[PDB]
Short mmCIF file of C-alpha atoms (C1' of nucleotides) and ligand atoms in Angstrom, two decimals:
data_model
loop_
_atom_site.label_atom_id
_atom_site.label_comp_id
_atom_site.label_asym_id
_atom_site.label_seq_id
_atom_site.Cartn_x
_atom_site.Cartn_y
_atom_site.Cartn_z
CA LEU B 639 27.29 20.49 -36.28
CA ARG B 640 26.50 22.95 -39.35
CA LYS B 641 29.73 23.06 -41.37
CA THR B 642 29.99 18.97 -40.87
CA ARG B 643 25.77 19.25 -42.83
CA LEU B 644 27.40 21.44 -44.94
CA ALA B 645 30.15 18.74 -45.97
CA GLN B 646 27.45 16.24 -46.61
CA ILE B 647 24.02 17.90 -47.90
CA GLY B 648 25.51 20.33 -49.52
CA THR B 649 22.83 22.54 -51.94
CA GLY B 650 21.15 19.83 -52.40
CA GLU B 651 21.21 19.81 -56.45
CA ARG B 652 20.83 17.43 -58.91
CA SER B 653 24.27 17.33 -59.64
CA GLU B 654 26.83 16.47 -56.20
CA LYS B 655 24.48 13.10 -56.45
CA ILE B 656 26.21 10.29 -54.95
CA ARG B 657 24.03 7.58 -56.14
CA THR B 658 21.07 7.50 -58.29
CA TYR B 659 18.07 5.95 -58.43
CA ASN B 660 16.86 5.12 -61.73
CA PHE B 661 13.25 3.59 -61.79
CA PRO B 662 12.75 2.96 -65.96
CA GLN B 663 16.07 1.33 -66.04
CA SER B 664 15.48 -0.68 -62.54
CA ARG B 665 19.19 0.47 -62.25
CA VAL B 666 20.64 1.69 -58.71
CA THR B 667 24.65 3.42 -59.69
CA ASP B 668 26.53 4.66 -56.90
CA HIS B 669 29.19 6.81 -59.15
CA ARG B 670 31.72 6.96 -56.01
CA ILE B 671 33.00 3.32 -56.77
CA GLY B 672 31.62 2.38 -59.73
CA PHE B 673 29.16 -0.06 -59.00
CA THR B 674 25.61 -0.19 -60.22
CA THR B 675 22.62 -3.36 -58.99
CA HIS B 676 19.34 -3.75 -60.88
CA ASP B 677 17.52 -5.01 -57.35
CA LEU B 678 16.23 -1.40 -57.38
CA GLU B 679 12.82 -3.29 -55.48
CA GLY B 680 14.72 -4.72 -53.31
CA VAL B 681 17.21 -1.76 -52.53
CA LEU B 682 14.14 0.32 -51.97
CA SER B 683 13.44 -1.92 -49.19
CA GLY B 684 16.31 -2.78 -47.43
CA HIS B 685 18.79 -5.12 -49.09
CA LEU B 686 21.63 -2.15 -49.02
CA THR B 687 24.80 -4.73 -47.62
CA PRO B 688 25.70 -5.13 -51.27
CA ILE B 689 26.53 -1.60 -51.87
CA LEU B 690 28.04 -1.29 -48.51
CA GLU B 691 30.55 -3.65 -48.77
CA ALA B 692 31.28 -2.72 -52.20
CA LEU B 693 32.31 0.55 -51.11
CA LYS B 694 33.95 -0.79 -48.02
CA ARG B 695 36.46 -2.21 -50.65
CA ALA B 696 36.88 0.22 -52.62
CA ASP B 697 38.08 1.95 -48.85
CA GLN B 698 40.20 -0.89 -47.85
CA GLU B 699 41.55 -0.55 -51.69
CA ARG B 700 42.08 2.85 -51.18
CA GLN B 701 43.60 2.64 -47.27
CA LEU B 702 46.90 1.71 -49.86
CA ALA B 703 50.54 3.30 -48.74
CA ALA B 704 52.17 4.32 -50.46
"C1'" U L 692 -1.81 61.41 -32.93
"C1'" G L 693 -4.20 53.98 -33.72
"C1'" C L 694 -7.42 50.06 -30.79
"C1'" C L 695 -10.12 49.27 -26.10
"C1'" C L 696 -17.00 52.21 -23.57
"C1'" G L 697 -16.55 45.59 -19.61
"C1'" G L 698 -14.68 49.23 -14.70
"C1'" U L 699 -14.76 54.89 -12.84
"C1'" G L 700 -16.22 59.88 -14.73
"C1'" C L 701 -19.83 63.30 -17.17
"C1'" C L 702 -23.66 63.29 -20.90
"C1'" G L 703 -28.45 61.73 -22.79
"C1'" G L 704 -32.89 58.15 -21.58
"C1'" A L 705 -41.07 61.39 -18.73
"C1'" A L 706 -40.29 53.16 -18.78
"C1'" G L 707 -39.24 49.77 -15.14
"C1'" G L 708 -36.68 48.35 -9.96
"C1'" U L 709 -35.61 51.30 -5.58
"C1'" C L 710 -36.73 55.26 -2.28
"C1'" A L 711 -37.69 60.30 2.62
"C1'" A L 712 -40.70 63.62 4.85
"C1'" G L 713 -45.92 63.68 4.04
"C1'" G L 714 -50.44 61.67 2.24
"C1'" G L 715 -53.50 57.50 3.41
"C1'" G L 716 -55.51 54.26 7.05
"C1'" A L 717 -57.02 47.96 6.29
"C1'" G L 718 -56.41 46.65 11.68
"C1'" G L 719 -54.97 47.09 16.38
"C1'" G L 720 -53.62 48.83 21.34
"C1'" G L 721 -54.11 52.28 26.48
"C1'" U L 722 -57.58 54.43 29.78
"C1'" G L 723 -62.84 55.95 30.61
"C1'" C L 724 -69.68 53.93 32.78
"C1'" A L 725 -69.75 56.57 28.37
"C1'" A L 726 -69.74 60.41 24.80
"C1'" G L 727 -64.37 60.35 23.84
"C1'" C L 728 -59.44 61.45 24.59
"C1'" C L 729 -54.79 59.20 23.12
"C1'" C L 730 -51.47 55.36 20.63
"C1'" C L 731 -49.89 52.20 16.98
"C1'" G L 732 -50.09 50.61 12.53
"C1'" A L 733 -50.95 47.09 6.31
"C1'" A L 734 -51.61 48.25 1.52
"C1'" C L 735 -51.66 52.46 -1.73
"C1'" C L 736 -49.77 57.38 -3.43
"C1'" G L 737 -45.21 59.49 -3.10
"C1'" A L 738 -38.49 64.03 -5.62
"C1'" A L 739 -33.56 63.93 -6.17
"C1'" G L 740 -30.25 59.96 -5.61
"C1'" C L 741 -29.12 54.96 -6.27
"C1'" C L 742 -29.88 50.44 -9.82
"C1'" C L 743 -31.22 49.76 -15.16
"C1'" C L 744 -30.39 51.35 -20.94
"C1'" G L 745 -27.95 54.28 -24.45
"C1'" G L 746 -23.25 58.05 -25.29
"C1'" U L 747 -18.67 59.30 -24.23
"C1'" G L 748 -10.95 59.86 -24.62
"C1'" A L 749 -6.97 66.32 -26.70
"C1'" A L 750 -12.94 62.32 -20.22
"C1'" C L 751 -9.94 58.75 -15.05
"C1'" G L 752 -7.40 55.12 -17.89
"C1'" G L 753 -5.91 50.34 -20.80
"C1'" C L 754 -3.26 48.58 -25.21
"C1'" G L 755 -2.19 39.50 -23.87
"C1'" G L 756 0.16 34.33 -22.67
"C1'" C L 757 1.39 29.31 -24.57
"C1'" C L 758 2.85 25.44 -28.41
"C1'" G L 759 3.85 24.58 -33.65
"C1'" U L 760 4.83 26.14 -39.02
"C1'" A L 761 9.32 27.69 -44.62
"C1'" A L 762 15.43 24.77 -49.83
"C1'" C L 763 21.77 23.39 -44.28
"C1'" U L 764 21.14 25.83 -39.41
"C1'" A L 765 18.70 29.73 -37.56
"C1'" U L 766 14.25 32.50 -37.80
"C1'" A L 767 9.08 32.39 -38.80
"C1'" A L 768 5.31 36.29 -43.06
"C1'" C L 769 1.78 31.51 -41.58
"C1'" G L 770 -1.55 28.29 -38.27
"C1'" G L 771 -3.75 25.82 -33.11
"C1'" U L 772 -5.64 27.06 -28.46
MG1 MG P 126 -4.79 58.50 -27.62
MG1 MG P 127 -13.63 52.16 -21.33
MG1 MG P 128 -17.82 54.36 -19.95
MG1 MG P 129 -21.22 52.32 -21.71
MG1 MG P 130 -28.02 60.12 -15.94
MG1 MG P 131 -41.31 62.37 11.36
MG1 MG P 132 -45.82 57.74 5.73
MG1 MG P 133 -48.54 58.48 9.01
MG1 MG P 134 -50.67 59.81 8.98
MG1 MG P 135 -62.76 49.09 27.03
MG1 MG P 136 -36.76 58.14 -9.44
MG1 MG P 137 -22.64 51.80 -11.59
MG1 MG P 138 -23.25 50.60 -19.25
MG1 MG P 139 -9.08 50.85 -17.22
MG1 MG P 140 -4.17 53.51 -13.72
MG1 MG P 141 14.18 23.86 -40.72
#
RNA sequence: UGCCCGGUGCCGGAAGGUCAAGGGGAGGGGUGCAAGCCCCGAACCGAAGCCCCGGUGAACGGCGGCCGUAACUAUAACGGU
């Protein structure tokens, strides 16, 4: 349970970031897939289904052998 | 060579409370014609000891429980009771 958490949380530094929420520019970027939206008020309210599907896509595009 | 004198010890305290023999004798009782003889007896006075108020540990001795809380987990300097 510990080695697995540190595989996810790490040190918690500013880097190691997975997804930035920039309020001044109403932007929400997810750096693993190259996806950004601008519905920040909607993202921080629950409408995350866009980014998840966008993540699932690159995951299925990842599972391409060989 | 720390903290606890509530308990036991010892030390201190001419106040107060309790307190024995004794002092005292309100008031009774036995008997006798009686003078009387005999008995009981309340208040009150009346030590040490004990109570009571203090002190005291290189005197007898005693020196907690539960619950929470910090940049991963853990722990908990910290908080509550
Ligand atoms: Mg000692
Ligand atoms: Mg003591
Ligand atoms: Mg003592
Ligand atoms: Mg004492
Ligand atoms: Mg004394
Ligand atoms: Mg006598
Ligand atoms: Mg007497
Ligand atoms: Mg007498
Ligand atoms: Mg007498
Ligand atoms: Mg007569
Ligand atoms: Mg006395
Ligand atoms: Mg005593
Ligand atoms: Mg005492
Ligand atoms: Mg003791
Ligand atoms: Mg003992
Ligand atoms: Mg923690």
